Design an enzyme around this catalytic site. Sequence first.
Site: not given
Lengths: 420, 420, 305
Positions: B125, B213
């Site tokens: 991530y 993101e």
Amino acid sequence: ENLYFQSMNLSLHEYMSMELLQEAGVSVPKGYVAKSPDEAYAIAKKLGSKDVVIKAQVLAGGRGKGTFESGLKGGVKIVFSPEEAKAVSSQMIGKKLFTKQTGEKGRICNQVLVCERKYPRREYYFAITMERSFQGPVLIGSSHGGVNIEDVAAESPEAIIKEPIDIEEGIKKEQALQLAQKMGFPPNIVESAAENMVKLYSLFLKYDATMIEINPMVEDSDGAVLCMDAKINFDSNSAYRQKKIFDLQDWTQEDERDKDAAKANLNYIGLDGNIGCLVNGAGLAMATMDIIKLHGGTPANFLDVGGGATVHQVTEAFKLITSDKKVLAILVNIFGGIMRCDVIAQGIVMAVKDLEIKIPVVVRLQGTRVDDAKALIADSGLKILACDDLDEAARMVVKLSEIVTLAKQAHVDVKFQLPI
Amino acid sequence: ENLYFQSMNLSLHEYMSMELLQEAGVSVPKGYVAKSPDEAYAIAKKLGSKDVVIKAQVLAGGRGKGTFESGLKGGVKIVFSPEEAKAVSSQMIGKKLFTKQTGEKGRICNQVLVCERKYPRREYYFAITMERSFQGPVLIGSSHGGVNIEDVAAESPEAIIKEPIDIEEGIKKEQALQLAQKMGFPPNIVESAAENMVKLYSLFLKYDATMIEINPMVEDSDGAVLCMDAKINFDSNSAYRQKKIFDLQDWTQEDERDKDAAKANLNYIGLDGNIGCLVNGAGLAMATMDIIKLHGGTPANFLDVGGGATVHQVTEAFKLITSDKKVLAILVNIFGGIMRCDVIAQGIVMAVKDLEIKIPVVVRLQGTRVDDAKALIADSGLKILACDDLDEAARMVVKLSEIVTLAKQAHVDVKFQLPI
Amino acid sequence: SYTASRQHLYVDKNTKIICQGFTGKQGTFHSQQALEYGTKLVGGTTPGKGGQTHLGLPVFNTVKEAKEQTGATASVIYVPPPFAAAAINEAIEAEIPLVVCITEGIPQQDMVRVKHKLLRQEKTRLIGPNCPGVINPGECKIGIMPGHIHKKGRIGIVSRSGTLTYEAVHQTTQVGLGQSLCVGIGGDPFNGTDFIDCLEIFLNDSATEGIILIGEIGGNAEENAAEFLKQHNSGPNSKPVVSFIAGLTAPPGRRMGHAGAIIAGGKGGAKEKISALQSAGVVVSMSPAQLGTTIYKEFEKRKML
Ligand SMILES: CC(C)(COP(=O)(O)OP(=O)(O)OC[C@H]1O[C@@H](n2cnc3c(N)ncnc32)[C@H](O)[C@@H]1OP(=O)(O)O)[C@@H](O)C(=O)NCCC(=O)NCCS
């Protein structure tokens, strides 16, 4: 739901079933068993020191959601170096796994399975299962593997292909191609699927299995479909002629009371109550549980002595109920039949005399020998509390359990005898 | 929680952000946009007619758990032939997606994203986000991608690496290598990760973004890390100088009332109540909501006219509240300040006169011009129900809403006026 | 079809019986008990020890010899579970009108082999395995059952668990309604008899006015029985039937694996079974202690007493 009460079918650890598939020639990812981090290191460096998967060999319903005492999530891990493989294995081997099925009495992870990690392209579910509806083995196949299969089966019953098999003529390869092509296999690897299903059916017939579930059977990124999981539920009755499989039974996964009961051919069912029992046959066992729950009680741990058991069997039985301390009042509820009631009367006499059974034994004996059993009970001259009505026996035993737990609170001792 | 009330940050569809990453040189799976099954077929056969993934371009919190009117589960599908790609796309394009966020007013899937399917080896991530704690952009990285990140961040705060950046000196490649090596990248592809992060930061600074993101940034089965998702939350205030990004805003994803409000620079907040409002500033908007909920009422759909808005803006505002039929009693609760109260008094006069606003307008006007506003209200001579205490105004409007809904039940008509 | 042998269940007082595995412990003891009751036992068969006289009756090397020497019309089996499948195959090959096997522990695969050739034949009916037996009260008992609580009456009892079958027998004898035919089909999933056969033998029999139907959780035979009683025991002239479901209050289960458990089943063995039982006009009891009182109440409600 399910059976539970009747028999605990032998479930092997994953690595044993994986080895069984390996020896049968079924296409399978390379896998090995590790008992310590050292051979985990050795196997990890043997497989390439990268892209390795570690699986916990614990027999429980929840394996990816369980928790270890060390504080690790799930039973499966993906390691990429032998060093971190050792690090994670040190947190699995010798550790106690906490899952919702166990709650707090978790099983201990004794070994782990080290396997190569392969990327699946498509996920198929497959299962060879004996069943009564089709009076024999059934090949179930679907293209919804890797996910729980009951939901998709109920919502989409068409997607679950079921094909029966005629046992005397065996399985035919044409049937395997039909199943593969109805699931939706690629037209280039259908032959491999047919060969895998033929080998799996040969294994199914050989080892006296009952249900071989491959979930998910996955095509690799380069063809050559490989099975991921190989759950096998065997047959309890096949112990006499399947020695190799049943000898490898892991006994750490069950309570020592269960092991002792199985050593003498006694079914055991533990519970969360405080009224022990001793019942002939599973049916009357559920009957006794229901009638006790009707009167506000709850059975603690009740048995099943089968048919034709010796007096030593019921002596070991009473030893087994009295071993647990959560029990307060014990009822032997055996009706006659194959199990000659007089040997049970002798067994209660001997077991109460020997182990000093001070708890109220609410006996209820009938069937094929009532004169001998009652005569022996009267001759022995003990507190063997006789009864002869099922509802009356349940009422009496529940009230006696309440009396015992009340007198324990009052710090006083009581003795129970038949009314004059 | 979050902001909600203050501004609705521009969220693009997935394919637009994927294209933005493509033009910036970021390593990315090949992807295209399909508006009909025909070009879906064309792209599927263009990418190899096998191993294709289809994604729904719907702006909602739930995209893999949503339901279509046609009866399909989730917004992502894995197809292996262009024909089944057409079949599944025919069940997405033109269909209405039902997710828990929408409940029943689901957005319609206008286009789909057709992409190549790649097998990830590791899941990282990553996120470049502006933040006040580090007074600027922050590179957040972790090795727990593909899974919700808040849970692992809260349970394991150490695993979430956060590194701030100095804006005037820009980002340095050494910083990118440091982040990559602290996440745990393989030592052979760290350079690619650094280049990807540098390109992403250049995109972040260029398009006036607020949060980029990448979840999950995944290494492929053959190196050359590729981003899977590219969520981008932009800045509402950057509309003036970012024309290309803001012109591509999808307006179908919001109510037509929201579009009309944005056409005139009015914040709009719909709700599930039956007391409309018209509030200056978000803070007094939450204040009005809280005070109405205190008195047992519930606001229906209330606005925010900003600062220095013209009379036409508040006329359009009142048109907008009166457009909804679930509203019963409207309170204009504007305190003075930047928003000159006299223009609001003129606006209420004009809007009540024009649109025939028969519902009880519980006005409460103050600030920097009270004489002019009240004088205009008195000169207009209407049912403009004046009030000057916040608690009294909330009490009055809640009681008037109850009176209106009661008289509607009684099938009688009422008219409201100030006590003499 | 094999179903054409349904009428073989109801044995009468003129049913000659042989007992395979005569010398076995349980075999000898329950042969003594059956002879004491009045069962027309006419010999036994033991491999390698036949051709002799035991218990005053001949014993032969095979069921062929027993059939050709006495012409017995039914057989019971007490051979060990390892060799039970071969004995049942031999009994079916000898064209025994009714064969009952009591043994428990038979491997599933061998029972599949037996059941297949049983279904490819119409002239032999099998009861078991893992069954208590079959009795015509006051006339003839076969298998393992305490005849000392049996009296001819107007109740037909069929149940899976043999021990709860005995319990129902006793609770019907206590109230004095007697018994017409009591059959334990056995809890084994692969058995030679099911609910449908016993229910329709009881329905078309005048000697029976009330049916007792005890089933356990797991499987779907109770759903089939409920459907059958809905189809053929509805409306007027429908004899009352009372059912019990052992395990109504029980732990959820083990949930070992998928497929044969729930996938291809009717996901039965729960609180939905009793619902299928009321929906078919079957009176259910909430405890295994009042079956006799429940059937008595059903008779007095309809005024058959
Ligand atoms: C059925 C059962 C009683 C037979 O075993 P057993 O009586 O305990 O022991 P036996 O050794 O006497 O049983 C086999 C006998 O049959 C003989 N036998 C051998 N092959 C046989 C065959 N093909 N057919 C019949 N009998 C055969 C054996 O020689 C032996 O007689 P023997 O003891 O004189 O040598 C036993 O298996 C049993 O437990 N019953 C079935 C399941 C159960 O638990 N009871 C009933 C459940 S409701």
